């Protein structure tokens, strides 16, 4: 009913233009909306010249892009212009004598610590916008020094603090800034990105920034000129934090641990600053999630609803600090659940901004977020916020549908709940639902027990095993029941908030009839893997099964695959399904495949002395330079063990068709001639992306012939076997739903099970020769074949001998 329109900005800060919502994020891209829920991108990324907000791009911002963020170290082959912040400036003086501007400030990046922060100004909001200065500079050393792929001079004296010197702003450099070898000495001090613009009370500015390293700064601002009035002499604040004469004051982080893209915002209905800043990394695998402090004043003390610092008292665990608003979780569409698809959940939400209306005293979280078995792939939320009693702003369990606060009557709280606890903790783990009944009589009971009171129109008092949450009860568009559904979310004084999601009143019996309705094993014709059964459906009902054939499949969904030319097996499975004294029954004819040879789906010959594929089903491949993703390198052409091969010089490397493999029942067949052997080089390697590979290395870490897998988990297929340079070498694996088998010239080397899923859902990239870490594979390669389902032995041999 209500409709979205998505878009992916990474970073988003959002910014009010008259009637029209902005969003400006990383990789310089931007949105539009008048409702914030329908966004329509106007930007074109990093698209030089004719760049939307910068023009020519490389010439616009030269002075930043001199000390990082320009085809240097990790921005090497591009450019780097992360989370900006946007907001317009009654008082800023233009070139031309004028008062007023919109200012971007961004963030160019090379290195973990080496960034600056400089920004940009302009008349109109969607630009172009016209560079102004460079203001924070980090990662510098004491002495000269360079990075890896970067001819850039870090010493302190390519950055403007000899100018600040000069100025009498500073009285020269600190010490403390660099380790006792010279190094910048990210420790105590600040990586320079994530900036965050803010008016406090009085209407003084103030810039926010940092992200890990020594972790949060703020710096008062010039209205007029948008420089740092910078503190000019070191120090403490009264309550014990850092002050340092360049970076500022530090209001959060330290000692390493995470925390970036930080927001603040003066709340004038409740008097404080409230502080917002992401812990965790932002990857599919990092635990990104949302952290939350306040204070009385614009530069600190920031603490939680604890009354702890947002500045960690050493280099520990910052779970503890801040209230975790969202982190991973899921409301899991169980079987018998309305709705399709495994229900509304996020990955890794953060990067937040805060759009607080100075009229309807309306907020709301903007951030982006990746989403449960969707890999990378992100969009931007928006989540309402809404002002607790012990003064915290709780966010609500759904995106932004339009509702508001609304007058609410016990008669419509009543009933069950899922509910969500977000904890404290945080990791690639999902947070699931556990379910709860508010009674009547003001008691909770269920999968826990305690209290509820309705307090005015709509706060929320909730006690659960012990805590007491407070926030609100409100109306939200559940998008998996379409259907608006009473909802509520409250915080702790620990910190800790808990979501809930009313569900539709029904009895035992149509419970059980709505989870056998659901209940389906998909296409059980063509079984040829196991089963899951799943033994639970929602609200806790029970499902139990059995089989009429255990030969066949058993009672838990494992199957027996007949031999090769064998009919295919037949069997029923059948579940009996509970809840209450409700019971009901569901059957399912399941028919099991035999074995197959595996198909060959691929085969790049290079017989045409090109880069093509045999069985047209794949492009051609393209070649690459000393990595993956590059370009620049040469592909030749030699005799081969089948006629003509690829030869790879030591510096290029052959790009595959993306999705090569995208299963997981696969195998590779391979003839390479080494000319050198070096460590963790690759033949065979694909990747769903840099974080989840798999590689066949003619000599690993133990000096041998392997198959190895990263990075999360990490797996060690090896075969004990080291391999000749000037042979030929043919080489072949198989994946099995977790098993894996190695072979070298027609022998096995290596049996094991448990081996990583890294294709399927993705569509991987593929290569030859090149990863992204170690040097490229220096000889011939011939005969790649690749293959859906697992090789045979008997097709191992045939193509290790003809
Ligand atoms: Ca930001
Ligand atoms: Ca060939």
């Given at each position: 009913d209500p409709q979205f329109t998505n878009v992916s900005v990474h970073d988003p800060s959002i910014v009010k233009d008259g009637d029209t919502y902005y969003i400006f994020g990383s990789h310089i891209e931007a949105a539009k909306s008048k409702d914030l829920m329908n966004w329509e991108k106007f930007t074109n990324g990093y698209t030089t010249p004719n760049n939307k907000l910068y023009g020519d791009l490389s010439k616009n911002l030269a002075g930043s892009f001199k000390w990082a963020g320009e085809n240097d170290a990790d921005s090497k082959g591009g450019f780097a212009v992360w989370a900006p912040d946007v907001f317009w400036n009654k008082d800023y003086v233009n070139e031309d004598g004028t008062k007023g501007a919109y200012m971007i400030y961004y963030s160019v990046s090379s290195t973990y610590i080496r960034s600056a922060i400089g920004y940009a100004v302009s008349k109109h909001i969607e630009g172009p916008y016209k560079y102004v200065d460079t203001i924070v500079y980090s990662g510098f050393t004491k002495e000269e020094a360079y990075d890896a792929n970067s001819k850039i001079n870090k010493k302190w004296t390519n950055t403007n603090i000899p100018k600040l010197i000069e100025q009498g702003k500073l009285k020269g450099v600190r010490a403390d800034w660099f380790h006792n070898d010279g190094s910048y000495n990210n420790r105590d001090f600040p990586n320079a990105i994530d900036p965050n613009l803010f008016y406090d009370e009085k209407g003084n500015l103030w810039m926010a920034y940092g992200s890990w390293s020594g972790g949060i700064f703020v710096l008062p601002m010039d209205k007029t000129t948008g420089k740092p009035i910078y503190p000019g002499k070191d120090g403490k604040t009264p309550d014990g934090r850092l002050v340092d004469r360049?970076?500022?004051?530090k209001i959060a982080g330290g000692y390493y641990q995470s925390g970036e893209g930080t927001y603040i915002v003066y709340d004038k209905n409740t008097d404080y600053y409230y502080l917002y800043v992401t812990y965790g990394w932002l990857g599919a695998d990092g635990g990104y999630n949302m952290r939350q402090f306040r204070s009385t004043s614009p530069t600190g003390p920031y603490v939680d609803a604890k009354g702890?610092?947002?500045?960690?008292?050493?280099?520990?665990?910052?779970?503890?600090?801040?209230?975790?608003?969202?982190?991973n979780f899921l409301f899991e569409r169980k079987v018998g659940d309305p709705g399709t698809g495994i229900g509304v959940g996020y990955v890794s939400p953060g990067h937040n901004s805060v759009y607080l209306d100075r009229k309807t005293g309306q907020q709301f979280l903007v951030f982006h977020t990746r989403f449960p078995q969707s890999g990378e792939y992100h969009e931007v939320r928006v989540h309402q916020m809404f002002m607790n009693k012990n003064g915290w702003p709780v966010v609500a369990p759904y995106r932004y549908a339009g509702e508001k606060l609304e007058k609410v009557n016990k008669q419509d709280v009543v009933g069950e709940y899922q509910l969500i606890n977000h904890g404290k903790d945080y990791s690639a783990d999902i947070k699931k639902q556990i379910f709860v009944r508010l009674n009547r009589n003001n008691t909770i009971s269920g999968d826990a027990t305690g209290t509820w009171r309705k307090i005015g129109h709509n706060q929320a008092e909730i006690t659960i095993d012990g805590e007491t949450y407070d926030g609100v009860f409100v109306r939200q568009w559940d998008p998996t029941s379409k259907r608006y559904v009473m909802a509520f979310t409250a915080l702790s004084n620990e910190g800790v908030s808990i979501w809930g999601s009313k569900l539709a009143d029904k009895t035992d019996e149509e419970i059980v009839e709505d989870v056998a309705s659901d209940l389906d094993l998909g296409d059980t014709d063509h079984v040829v893997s196991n089963l899951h059964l799943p033994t639970e459906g929602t609200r806790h009902t029970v499902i139990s099964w059995t089989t009429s054939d255990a030969k066949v499949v058993?009672?838990?969904?494992?199957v027996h695959r007949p031999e090769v030319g064998s009919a295919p097996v037949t069997a029923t499975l059948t579940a009996t399904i509970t809840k209450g004294d409700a019971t009901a029954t569901k059957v399912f004819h399941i028919t099991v495949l035999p074995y197959e040879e595996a198909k060959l789906t691929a085969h790049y010959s290079f017989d045409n002395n090109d880069l093509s594929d045999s069985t047209g089903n794949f492009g051609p491949g393209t070649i690459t330079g000393n990595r993956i993703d590059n370009e620049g390198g040469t592909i030749a052409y030699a005799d081969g063990k089948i006629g003509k091969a690829a030869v790879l010089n030591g510096q290029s490397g052959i790009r595959l068709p993306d999705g090569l493999v995208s299963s997981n029942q696969y195998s590779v067949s391979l003839w390479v001639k080494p000319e050198q052997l070096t460590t963790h080089t690759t033949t065979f390697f694909g990747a769903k992306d840099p974080n989840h590979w798999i590689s066949l290395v003619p000599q690993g870490w133990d000096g041998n012939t392997m198959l190895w897998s990263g990075s999360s988990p990490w797996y060690d297929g090896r075969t004990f076997w080291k391999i000749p340079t000037g042979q030929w070498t043919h080489l072949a694996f198989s994946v099995d739903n977790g098993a894996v088998k190695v072979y070298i010239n027609g022998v096995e080397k290596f049996s094991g099970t448990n081996?990583?899923?890294?294709?399927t859902g993705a569509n991987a990239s593929f290569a030859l020769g090149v990863n992204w870490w170690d040097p490229p594979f220096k000889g011939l390669i011939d005969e790649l074949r690749i293959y859906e389902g697992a090789l045979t032995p008997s097709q191992v041999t045939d193509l290790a001998q003809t």
């Amino acid at each position: 009913d209500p409709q979205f329109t998505n878009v992916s900005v990474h970073d988003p800060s959002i910014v009010k233009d008259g009637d029209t919502y902005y969003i400006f994020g990383s990789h310089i891209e931007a949105a539009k909306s008048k409702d914030l829920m329908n966004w329509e991108k106007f930007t074109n990324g990093y698209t030089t010249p004719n760049n939307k907000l910068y023009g020519d791009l490389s010439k616009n911002l030269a002075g930043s892009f001199k000390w990082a963020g320009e085809n240097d170290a990790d921005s090497k082959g591009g450019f780097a212009v992360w989370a900006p912040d946007v907001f317009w400036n009654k008082d800023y003086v233009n070139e031309d004598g004028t008062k007023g501007a919109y200012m971007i400030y961004y963030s160019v990046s090379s290195t973990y610590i080496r960034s600056a922060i400089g920004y940009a100004v302009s008349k109109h909001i969607e630009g172009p916008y016209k560079y102004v200065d460079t203001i924070v500079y980090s990662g510098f050393t004491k002495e000269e020094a360079y990075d890896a792929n970067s001819k850039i001079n870090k010493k302190w004296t390519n950055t403007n603090i000899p100018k600040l010197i000069e100025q009498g702003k500073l009285k020269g450099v600190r010490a403390d800034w660099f380790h006792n070898d010279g190094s910048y000495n990210n420790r105590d001090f600040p990586n320079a990105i994530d900036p965050n613009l803010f008016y406090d009370e009085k209407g003084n500015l103030w810039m926010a920034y940092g992200s890990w390293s020594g972790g949060i700064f703020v710096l008062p601002m010039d209205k007029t000129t948008g420089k740092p009035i910078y503190p000019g002499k070191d120090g403490k604040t009264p309550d014990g934090r850092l002050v340092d004469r360049y970076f500022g004051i530090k209001i959060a982080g330290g000692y390493y641990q995470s925390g970036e893209g930080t927001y603040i915002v003066y709340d004038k209905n409740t008097d404080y600053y409230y502080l917002y800043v992401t812990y965790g990394w932002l990857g599919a695998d990092g635990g990104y999630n949302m952290r939350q402090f306040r204070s009385t004043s614009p530069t600190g003390p920031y603490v939680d609803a604890k009354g702890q610092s947002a500045v960690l008292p050493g280099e520990v665990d910052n779970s503890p600090y801040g209230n975790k608003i969202m982190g991973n979780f899921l409301f899991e569409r169980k079987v018998g659940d309305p709705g399709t698809g495994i229900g509304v959940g996020y990955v890794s939400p953060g990067h937040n901004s805060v759009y607080l209306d100075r009229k309807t005293g309306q907020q709301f979280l903007v951030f982006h977020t990746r989403f449960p078995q969707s890999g990378e792939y992100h969009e931007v939320r928006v989540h309402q916020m809404f002002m607790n009693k012990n003064g915290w702003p709780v966010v609500a369990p759904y995106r932004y549908a339009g509702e508001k606060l609304e007058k609410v009557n016990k008669q419509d709280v009543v009933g069950e709940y899922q509910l969500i606890n977000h904890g404290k903790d945080y990791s690639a783990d999902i947070k699931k639902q556990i379910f709860v009944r508010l009674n009547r009589n003001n008691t909770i009971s269920g999968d826990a027990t305690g209290t509820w009171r309705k307090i005015g129109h709509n706060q929320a008092e909730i006690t659960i095993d012990g805590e007491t949450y407070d926030g609100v009860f409100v109306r939200q568009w559940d998008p998996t029941s379409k259907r608006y559904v009473m909802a509520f979310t409250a915080l702790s004084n620990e910190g800790v908030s808990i979501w809930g999601s009313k569900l539709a009143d029904k009895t035992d019996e149509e419970i059980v009839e709505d989870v056998a309705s659901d209940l389906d094993l998909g296409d059980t014709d063509h079984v040829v893997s196991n089963l899951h059964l799943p033994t639970e459906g929602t609200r806790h009902t029970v499902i139990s099964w059995t089989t009429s054939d255990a030969k066949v499949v058993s009672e838990t969904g494992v199957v027996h695959r007949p031999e090769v030319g064998s009919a295919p097996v037949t069997a029923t499975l059948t579940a009996t399904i509970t809840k209450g004294d409700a019971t009901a029954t569901k059957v399912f004819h399941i028919t099991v495949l035999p074995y197959e040879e595996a198909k060959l789906t691929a085969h790049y010959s290079f017989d045409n002395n090109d880069l093509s594929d045999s069985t047209g089903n794949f492009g051609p491949g393209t070649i690459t330079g000393n990595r993956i993703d590059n370009e620049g390198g040469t592909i030749a052409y030699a005799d081969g063990k089948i006629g003509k091969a690829a030869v790879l010089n030591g510096q290029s490397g052959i790009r595959l068709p993306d999705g090569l493999v995208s299963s997981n029942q696969y195998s590779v067949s391979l003839w390479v001639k080494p000319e050198q052997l070096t460590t963790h080089t690759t033949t065979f390697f694909g990747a769903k992306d840099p974080n989840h590979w798999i590689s066949l290395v003619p000599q690993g870490w133990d000096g041998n012939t392997m198959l190895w897998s990263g990075s999360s988990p990490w797996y060690d297929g090896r075969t004990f076997w080291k391999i000749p340079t000037g042979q030929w070498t043919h080489l072949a694996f198989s994946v099995d739903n977790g098993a894996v088998k190695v072979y070298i010239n027609g022998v096995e080397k290596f049996s094991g099970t448990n081996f990583p899923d890294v294709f399927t859902g993705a569509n991987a990239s593929f290569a030859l020769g090149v990863n992204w870490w170690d040097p490229p594979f220096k000889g011939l390669i011939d005969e790649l074949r690749i293959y859906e389902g697992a090789l045979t032995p008997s097709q191992v041999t045939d193509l290790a001998q003809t």
